[PDB]
Design a protein around this ligand. Sequence first.
Ligand SMILES: CCC(=O)NCCCC[C@H](N)C(=O)OP(=O)(O)OC[C@H]1O[C@@H](n2cnc3c(N)ncnc32)[C@H](O)[C@@H]1O
Ligand SMILES: CCC(=O)NCCCC[C@H](N)C(=O)OP(=O)(O)OC[C@H]1O[C@@H](n2cnc3c(N)ncnc32)[C@H](O)[C@@H]1O
Ligand SMILES: [Mg+2]
Ligand SMILES: [Mg+2]
Lengths: 263, 263
Amino acid sequence: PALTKSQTDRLEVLLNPKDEISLNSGKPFRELESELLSRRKKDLQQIYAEERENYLGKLEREITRFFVDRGFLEIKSPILIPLEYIERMGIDNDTELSKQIFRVDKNFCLRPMLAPNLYNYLRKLDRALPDPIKIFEIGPCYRKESDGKEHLEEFTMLNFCQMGSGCTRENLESIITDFLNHLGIDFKIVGDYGDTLDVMHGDLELSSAVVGPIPLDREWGIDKPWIGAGFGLERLLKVKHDFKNIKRAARSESYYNGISTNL
Amino acid sequence: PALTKSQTDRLEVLLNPKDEISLNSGKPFRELESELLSRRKKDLQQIYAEERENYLGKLEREITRFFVDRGFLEIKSPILIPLEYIERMGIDNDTELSKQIFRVDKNFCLRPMLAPNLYNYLRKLDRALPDPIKIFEIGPCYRKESDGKEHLEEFTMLNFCQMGSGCTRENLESIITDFLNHLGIDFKIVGDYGDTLDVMHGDLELSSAVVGPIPLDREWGIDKPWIGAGFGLERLLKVKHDFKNIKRAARSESYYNGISTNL
Ligand SMILES: CCC(=O)NCCCC[C@H](N)C(=O)OP(=O)(O)OC[C@H]1O[C@@H](n2cnc3c(N)ncnc32)[C@H](O)[C@@H]1O
Ligand SMILES: CCC(=O)NCCCC[C@H](N)C(=O)OP(=O)(O)OC[C@H]1O[C@@H](n2cnc3c(N)ncnc32)[C@H](O)[C@@H]1O
Ligand SMILES: [Mg+2]
Ligand SMILES: [Mg+2]
């Protein structure tokens, strides 16, 4: 008897990429399930005995080393930010991204992006640090999505930026290229001062990158050239580990390093 | 002319511990301010030229290494959790901690603690990992406080726990002792199965620790012995760097590694 769709969904939860297992084979569900449970338990046992690191934490540490070694200051700014920051980012209540904001009190929200806080750091550090000013942050961001296969409501962004000298399109592309080649992730940069560039892996957007200046800058007290880009860590993990579903790369109680925890 | 209280507040923002500067000295405000601005800019310049690491990120990486090296699995679980988890933690709407929860939708909240998610991981991993099960998480937690000098609304917790064999009071105390002596933080353990222990630095609570089992366990499908403790990273930093105000240790736009960013 062929497998049901429910049975197949269950096995797919337990399936890891390159299991090299045959589903249309003849063996009963009970046996296919038991084999996969056995392998996934062995996977968790191996992690526990050997490395013990979470993929998302580990990627964050690897990205952090990359940017610190190339002259970028590590920032840790608030996750809960004023709603006023969202309007000052030019996100009107009429816009689609405005519908995606998780509001917290009358006055606050979960940040949907790193830009507002990094803008403020750029302005502030310009009074203390020599040109060029190079900073980055990694951390949680939040957007209400009709999520599915490549959007999470709770995700993790990297944003880096440089302000002052050396803020060219060529340098932005070179940093992106060095970064992704260091992680071992395949990509192409797609796009036409004011440039928006998308870093794609096939149809999947890994990053939006910007070559400033842009008019928004003056709302944040910024009047120098700048370059920057934002990457989703879960997307990077999804590509790197060949997960079919981005939920396998998320902060989660249902997956650990892409392995089902419902065993 | 003596300094005003406002002037003194301003200088205190710029003052770092062991500046060895004399305020009741005779020199005008303008000059004292200029000296401190100069030193704080030099501090940021030194960080930028040399290490480039944020203290909170760096402490997290150091704590992570400590626990991974001693057999604990690194967890990264959701920050946004179901409100049902809070009631199942035995936090009634009549309780004070219930007033402190940041609600997000009808159904979700920002986690005020790590326990509910770690409970779920303990139950799940018990089907896969050999006894004893040893896990930890580090990350953001949220409580509405009348904050002041030692509470933040947005803070960072470490929680570790062990379940199964070896779950004794002596072992819990030994792990706490090794951890704090590794960080170089002075402490005493204060307290009388079911034990609550507070780890104190003078009057400042660094941790609450628990020797299970306790009755709550069965709401989470846990029926084995366990031990665990939760530490605030910002409190640890405050003690370690001798900050007078915990805001200097927080995720912030006003302080970087305890140095004012308003220069
Ligand atoms: C100082 C300002 C600065 O430095 N600006 C430069 C940053 C420009 C860009 C600016 N940072 C920007 O916001 O784009 P995005 O909303 O498309 O998000 C960027 C990336 O986040 C990931 N991402 C976005 N939403 C999600 C989601 N719901 N789930 C998972 N990953 C996501 C995804 O990888 C996407 O490509
Ligand atoms: C599986 C369950 C488990 O493993 N349980 C063991 C954990 C027991 C204990 C359990 N984890 C517990 O919740 O106590 P707390 O609310 O007093 O918070 C603990 C610590 O967080 C810090 N802390 C708490 N609130 C704040 C704040 N508003 N600002 C800064 N630091 C804070 C502070 O260091 C405090 O000592
Ligand atoms: Mg985009
Ligand atoms: Mg307490």
